[PDB]
Amino acid sequence: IKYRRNELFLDVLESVNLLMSPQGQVLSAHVSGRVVMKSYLSGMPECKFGMNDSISFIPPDGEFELMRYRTTKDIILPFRVIPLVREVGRTKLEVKVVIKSNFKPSLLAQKIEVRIPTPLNTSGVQVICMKGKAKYKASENAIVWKIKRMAGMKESQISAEIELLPTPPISMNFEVPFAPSGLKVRYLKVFEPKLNYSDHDVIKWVRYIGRSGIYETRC
Amino acid sequence: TTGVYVKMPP
Missing domain, CATH: 2.60.40.1170 (Mu homology domain, subdomain B)
Incomplete structure (x- = not known):
């Protein structure tokens, strides 16, 4: 468990569902989502995720669906x-x-x-x-x-x-570039107290993918 | 752009 280029990629995947009336009423709607984080970090760091409306953990070096939300109010x-x-x-x-x-x-x-x-x-x-x-x-x-x-x-x-x-x-x-849910990744603090590489020393990547x-x- | 990643703003 040791890399020279420290990166990680946050995936915010979504699926906005709608249901309109001929006139213009939003009879029904909501979004279901999960956030996958593809990482390659040296050591066993305890992280800090951010967002709107923050789960801490030690990422299974490789790939893993962090959480998985499902909003229903104020949808795009x-x-x-x-x-x-x-x-x-x-x-x-x-x-x-x-x-x-x-x-x-x-x-x-x-x-x-x-x-x-x-x-x-x-x-x-x-x-x-x-x-x-x-x-x-x-x-x-x-x-x-x-x-x-x-x-x-x-x-x-x-x-x-x-x-x-x-x-x-x-x-x-x-398909869209933004997340209909309104969510947004605020921060992802990478911290491995043992080794010499810092957080604002990592390369962070995040993408928003909304499917219909x-x-x-x-x- | 749809799969293209983007640098976070820490």
């Missing part, structure tokens, strides 16, 4: 989906959804995907989107609309047309 909803459905005869279905990014322009949400579900009397789907790239997968049955990367606070609409046939909510997905689990929005 990374995206804001808002659709518009217009009926006609029984021939066509007018549908326009719009996603919104609610975060610091200095951050890029990636791996975005909206799934606007169609009905079973579907004959053909037409769609246009100045941004992104979508298609109507008849098997899964929906208009998978994928987006490479999207900045924050910006807007983006996708207008489709479901050609009905004579005779569910829009799910979303996304159940981000459905009633149509």
Whole structure:
């Protein structure tokens, strides 16, 4: 147990879940998270973690999920989906959804995907989107609309047309650079009283990764 | 950036 380059990497992983109403009510929401700390420290130091709303320990040199929280109040909803459905005869279905990014322009949400579900009397789907790239997968049955990367606070609409046939909510997905829970690693004091390497002598690394689990929005 | 780490501000 002895390294020359002393580092450690804090992983704050999340999964923000949402449940909205066609109008705009947050019928349900919460986030589940665990913090993994990948370290390589010399000796057997007793640490001091920090954060918002601080567990002390002696890290199992290697990799170990420190704690694991699960907030439910005052949550950050990374995206804001808002659709518009217009009926006609029984021939066509007018549908326009719009996603919104609610975060610091200095951050890029990636791996975005909206799934606007169609009905079973579907004959053909037409769609246009100045941004992104979508298609109507008849098997899964929906208009998978994928987006490479999207900045924050910006807007983006996708207008489709479901050609009905004579005779569910829009799910979303996304990875982010920040933690929706609001959490934040304040400090991680590395202390091995035996050996000569200090705390402000270590290289600390921390990353925030928010995944979207159940981000459905009633149509 | 999504997996890129970042130095903490002690």
